[PDB]
Amino acid sequence: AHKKGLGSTRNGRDSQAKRLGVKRYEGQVVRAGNILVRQRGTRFKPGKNVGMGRDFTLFALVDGVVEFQDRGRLGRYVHVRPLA
RNA sequence: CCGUGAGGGAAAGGUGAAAAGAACCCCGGGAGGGGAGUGAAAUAGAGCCUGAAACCGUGGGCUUACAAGCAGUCACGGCCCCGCAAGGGGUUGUGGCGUGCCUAUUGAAGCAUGAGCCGGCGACUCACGGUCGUGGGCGAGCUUAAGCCGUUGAGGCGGAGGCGUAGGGAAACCGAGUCCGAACAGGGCGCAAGCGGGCCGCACGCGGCCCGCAAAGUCCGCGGCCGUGGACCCGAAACCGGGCGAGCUAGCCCUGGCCAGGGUGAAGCUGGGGUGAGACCCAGUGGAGGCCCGAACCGGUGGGGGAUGCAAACCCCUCGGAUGAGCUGGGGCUAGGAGUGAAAAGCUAACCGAGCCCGGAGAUAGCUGGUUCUCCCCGAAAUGACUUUAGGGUCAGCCUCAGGCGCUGACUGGGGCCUGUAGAGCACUGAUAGGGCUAGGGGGCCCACCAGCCUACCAAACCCUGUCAAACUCCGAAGGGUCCCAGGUGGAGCCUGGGAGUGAGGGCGCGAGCGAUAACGUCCGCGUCCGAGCGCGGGAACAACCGAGACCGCCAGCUAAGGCCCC
RNA sequence: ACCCUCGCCAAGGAACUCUGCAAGUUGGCCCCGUAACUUCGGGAGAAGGGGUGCUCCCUGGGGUGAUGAGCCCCGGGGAGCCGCAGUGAACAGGCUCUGGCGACUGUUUACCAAAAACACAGCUCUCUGCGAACUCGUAAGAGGAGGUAUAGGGAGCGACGCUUGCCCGGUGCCGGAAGGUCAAGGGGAGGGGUGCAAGCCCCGAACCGAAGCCCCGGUGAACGGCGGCCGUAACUAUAACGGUCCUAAGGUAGCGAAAUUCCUUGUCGGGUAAGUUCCGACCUGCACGAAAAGCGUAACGACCGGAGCGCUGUCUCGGCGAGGGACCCGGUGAAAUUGAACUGGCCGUGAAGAUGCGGCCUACCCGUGGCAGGACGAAAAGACCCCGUGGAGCUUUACUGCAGC
RNA sequence: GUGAAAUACCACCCUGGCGCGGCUGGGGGCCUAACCCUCGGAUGGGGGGACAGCGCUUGGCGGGCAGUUUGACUGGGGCGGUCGCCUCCUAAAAGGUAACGGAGGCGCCCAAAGGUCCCCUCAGGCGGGACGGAAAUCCGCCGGAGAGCGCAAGGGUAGAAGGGGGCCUGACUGCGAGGCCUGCAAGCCGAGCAGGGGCGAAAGCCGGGCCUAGUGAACCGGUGGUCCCGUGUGGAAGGGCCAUCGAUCAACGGAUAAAAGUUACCCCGGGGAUAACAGGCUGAUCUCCCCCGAGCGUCCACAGCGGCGGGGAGGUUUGGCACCUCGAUGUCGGCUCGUCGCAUCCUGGGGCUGAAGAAGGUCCCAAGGGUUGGGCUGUUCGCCCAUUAAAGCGGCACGCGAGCUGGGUUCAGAACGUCGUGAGACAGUUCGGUCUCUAUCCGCCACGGGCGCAGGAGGCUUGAGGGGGGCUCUUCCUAGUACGAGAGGACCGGAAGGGACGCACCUCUGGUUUCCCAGCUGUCCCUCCAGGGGCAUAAGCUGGGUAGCCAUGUGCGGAAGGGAUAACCGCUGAAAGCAUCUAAGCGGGAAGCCCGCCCCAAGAUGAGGCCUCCCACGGCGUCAAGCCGGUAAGGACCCGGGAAGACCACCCGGUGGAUGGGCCGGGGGUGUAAGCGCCGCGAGGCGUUGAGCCGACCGGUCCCAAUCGUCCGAGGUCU
RNA sequence: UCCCCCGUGCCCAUAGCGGCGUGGAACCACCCGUUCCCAUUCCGAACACGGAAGUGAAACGCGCCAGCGCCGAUGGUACUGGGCGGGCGACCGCCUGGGAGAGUAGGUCGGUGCGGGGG
């Protein structure tokens, strides 16, 4: 029988997964309120017809379609062009 | 029958209508038989109706001493037996193929569990509630309970009462509304039920009778599941109550008995010495003692033997005590958290860390085991979250059934983005070898403070050449995710409800961790098989490797993997 | 064959083995003669020897008679005889030296432990003033005890000898009229509910209210604690000597690799040809120590160790003999176990150890006496281990109660 | 003047103390009459005495007792660690994703670090700069973000979320379309409407904070409001609703308001879901060999060695894993009995040597056979003693407990040290402690029975194929010679002895010999003396002792010899005009291999061979047995026996006979019988006398017994 | 329509940085002042106001260059959906789709709408 004293650790704790990311991709029809993106920082700037919540939480406020737009060094966006 | 006792507690029924129960003869000591006789029957002949199976025999048919096996099965052949025949029955000589049943498991022929064999007993029920479903009755309603009257396998009556017809509010309360609110803002519960439709009074009107069974419910029957009950059956170690036990053992009380023979020779006495008397020294006597040796007796030291024993503690040899804290008969007392204990938790009626019996009692058992007829359709799980949870559970995932919805499913084509792995690359964060240049610092020529000069040492920052990274990224695929439009009629999908089981997984491939890039290792990810395909072919044999999804039959055909010299 | 119980054995003589386990040796009686040590009783059966039959002769005591003979009972001296052998058979200690542990005789785990365990005389502490304390019991009552401090109860140690240090901080026990806190109850400033009111109901601050704990002193043959760390003497080492502290204080004597020593077969010495044991020492005591006593001690022990002598079948190393079985016949006639069996070897393979798969090898059918490697042989639903929100016994400054005070 | 502060006088009061008095409490003392105890029985006398006892109630102490609690995870369990939340990675470019994987944080804080309006832009690099480090604050360029943002990390960010200033409190109330996330309930984003506000000219923005941790369901209660309910009525008490409070319920989905240990005195239910043994897988560790050649070896890498490092094999170590076995796979050491491997301790062959010889070293070939006795410890192992040719290393469930032992270890007792308050405990010690007559199958050793072997018999045989056995030392002669300065000291060949072992044997030596002989004791008996018998073991004791069986005793054995080979050494010889053992062909060469030697053996169904015997159909089916009863050669049965033997078998006899028993002779053992005579008082001693008795052995002799008989068994299938 | 300038957006480096031109007629800026609205942590620097002598110096606008920055092929690899194989293993190969990053050739000192003033 050999079980010499067994060492120990500690750094064995992690955090809960937050399921962040883009929740609605361009072309998708969305009602007002539908929280499109749900990032942490400003990865995606609020576009026309879009609203930013406490946590930069992007959400549409107009019943229409979705669509992004890369402005280069101006940061990406995500406006919901109205179903006109 | 068992136990001292409380108490436990069996087994065992059948001649025949009628004893008519077998006179008598024969073998025999008898038993038992053979005749005779009774009877419808005696293989109804006496523990006798019927009398199965295991088991034991006698006779016959086939067949066996060079073969080897989960005992069979498929194929021919021989012998025997039926029938006219075709055909069939029994046996088994060769050949081919073949890893018991149950259980439990990731996995069993398994050298894991259970079973000697046969027969008989042996486990998912019942009551009342609940929830679905279903066969009926009546339905803006339905229905009685106790009890009464009747029957004597006759039903009636009985509206107390219960559900249902209004939802809301914590409530007062209001009401198709209501609750929060100041609010005709909002919002949470709520409601908004006709008719597929024959007929027909026979208004150019459908009334409304009718209808499914609803608006819509109830009642009764049946079935599934749930709750409370022992709630599928068997099983604890234990807990508690009332009793029975000291004829075993422990301790004390009373009253009686037993201890061959020897050995040793305490104190005392007496005598002789002794001295001034004494002490004291000698003998002698004496007969003390948890004294000695050793039978009885009481012990149980070592060894052997015994080990389904002579024996549930024995036998043999050898040992301890043996006038003592000794041994022993009879009569008595103390007992279950109690007694007793020269103290081992010993002993308390052959298992005492808490006696035995009966009772609570069918204790509880998230554990183990077992769970009995046939066929047909579908068919899992071994994951996640939480759990005094981790071999148990609740919800979800996956299975199934009923009803509803009807192209929405998996998969695929075309669009649009979402992303930072592979790879690569240093621009960031760090790591990097050498070289250049160059703050310093050893230190060096030193004209000595004013700098200075040199240095195959140390050495920043910075540039050049070479690289490194899961927690680096200037960059970045393949793919993957999702939405839209299209294909796609599948034991596809979606919605509502009834029944689950599963929450130990395993091997292989690939992508990571751990490990020591060891493990038939371990932990996740996708996939796939096994599981449940220990069904079939290949791989010598072999759950998961290659082939391939077994409804049944065929003395037909083409193939798969793998093969094509013989086996 | 083998097993039991018994007999003998050449040469050796413990080389056997955990161990002289077993067996043998020795064994009665008489006479010589016996060591250390000692509590002067012992150790004494210490050891170590010698004698032991029978015949004849002589002779002394006693008991009974009678003082005599007989008959009994103890002796003393002489000669001689025969065996391998004279307690001629049976009953019948092997001895010694040295340690440990208990004093001694004794008691105990009925059925694996007889002991260094219990007990024990003796020592100390403590309670009890007698309706004693304590024990049983609800109570009455009873034991204590028809006892009374030279008694009882409880506790530890355990003859005897020399002794039994240091620390009272904490726990316990004894004593304690300062103080802290604390129950019922008392007391009621003040406040409340209702009544038209008198009222009737309540709440409630000061303050007064027991043991208890805290506190203060004592107490060790009360529970207990006695670790360390620095400095220091004519090499070196050591430290009589000083200092230090979270605690209260830091091991006095005596013992010591011990029933205690991890390192360890410590290191010296002894005994042996050779010694992890043993004996005597040293002291680095992992982790002795004074009454859960320290250190000794004659005597005692079916206790445990180590050595010698003796003698052996223990062994080298077996042999033969005997009897009771085993074997065969007649009689009688069990058992655990058992899925069924038509039950072989090797390499493999397989849930990792197959008579049963594969390939090969071997192999006529059926018994009888033997052996014990396999049938993961039998027996017992592993006593170890883990699991179960299983169970019991026991402990305490775990919780919560209760008796008792 | 001193002091912090001033004193004559005047007061209001405070501190503490003493008196006399109300309020409330304590503790004594005396009394007797309740209660208690006592006196030769007492309506009474003593003693205690309102205490004690006893009732109700307060608080206390309280393992003496009772009921219980003492978590989970976990590469077994325990010990250690951990348990909720946040960041990054692992995570395989959506989301999610595990491990006792890798690395860090949280259990707060801010009234300004909040709302809004208006301004401002950093860090560093290089210059130049009073104290000024290498960053204080300045000035000038250059600098898109590397600074800053309360704290971890990440994301984000100057077109501000950063830095400053002004008013402010939206860190609102009533709501809340629509979503993210999700088992449950929780978490999260939030436009928009209403009420009443803040800042801005206005557009507008404000329902805390750049963002992601800073947290806790329910239950039970507290405090404000509510006016909702309030037990006949009214009011109250008490609830409800709204708001808010008390959680290291941190084991962080939270069992009770309330909880630790121990068991070797232990018990049940389960598990090979899970540890200890053995096996299995693996091979880090272990053992072994190989590659490289620093560098040692006077010189020289490789005689012998081998730095740093590298590649392997084995599966005997210590482990890892947790795969069969927990309705049981007995565990260390010894004994017994073997058997295998070779990585060889000895012995046999051989290469190189830093090999003169002798003795070594090293490597290659080679297990055929060997591989000692003791002291110590339970030991394995080791250390010693004395030897040896050597005192090999491993495997077989660390071989072997239905084979033995039980000394070590693991049950109950007891003690030491030590840990614990304790009960108890300790890979610490110490003494003690029940290891189960029966073998069914396989396997193994032996012995039979049946049938077969294609006529039946009685003999003798061949040997396919098995088994046994294989050892080694010393001395002498070659020759004190080759070799060697010397000391020492061989090969090859040839002898004689040993040791262990094996088979057989009993002449000898030495055992045993259970009644062969003698001697002896006690007792009972026959028959009194004498002479005898039983018993004192299953021999009473003692001394002897044939046959048989035996070792300590005796004789033999290992071979010799032939053949093929290992390493190794060559001949001839190309490819490659040389060289080369190789490619073709040929040799030499081991205790090893084959055969030789001893033993078994034709169930060698492949059933063999040789010699000799007896042979016929006689009655009867499918006409050579497919058939019956006598037969034949022969064979059993039965009997007498046996150095044969458990039984069976095998061998020898059976009256034509020496088989056993007896009798006779001889061996052989006892060691002078009885009786009688002589001497002695007697025990005894002479003599007759090597007498008597007398198993098995070597033989004679029909005296007794193997009387007499019976039953099987050919008639022999095919070209 | 066409050049120049002034405001504004889009594209977000081939849209810039840095050198070298040049421009003021107009617009713009610098300036002249700062009594007044308004100001600075202190400065009219910056905001702000009233102006108009001088100027293009600054700043800005518009050209020029490739050196830094940036952009960046084509080929060929890497890697990889899917399919099929090899090695004891560490790993690796063929088929079929997709297909980088670096590197090289080379590209660039912008393009462009709406409204104003002016030739």
Ligand SMILES: [Mg+2]
């Ligand atoms: Mg917001």
Ligand SMILES: [Mg+2]
């Ligand atoms: Mg009885």
Ligand SMILES: [Mg+2]
């Ligand atoms: Mg008749």
Ligand SMILES: [Mg+2]
């Ligand atoms: Mg009948």
Ligand SMILES: [Mg+2]
């Ligand atoms: Mg009848």
Ligand SMILES: [Mg+2]
């Ligand atoms: Mg019958």
Ligand SMILES: [Mg+2]
């Ligand atoms: Mg054959």
Ligand SMILES: [Mg+2]
């Ligand atoms: Mg045959």
Ligand SMILES: [Mg+2]
């Ligand atoms: Mg099972």
Ligand SMILES: [Mg+2]
């Ligand atoms: Mg399963």
Ligand SMILES: [Mg+2]
């Ligand atoms: Mg089996």
Ligand SMILES: [Mg+2]
């Ligand atoms: Mg089985």
Ligand SMILES: [Mg+2]
């Ligand atoms: Mg089981």
Ligand SMILES: [Mg+2]
């Ligand atoms: Mg079963």
Ligand SMILES: [Mg+2]
């Ligand atoms: Mg049955």
Ligand SMILES: [Mg+2]
């Ligand atoms: Mg049955």
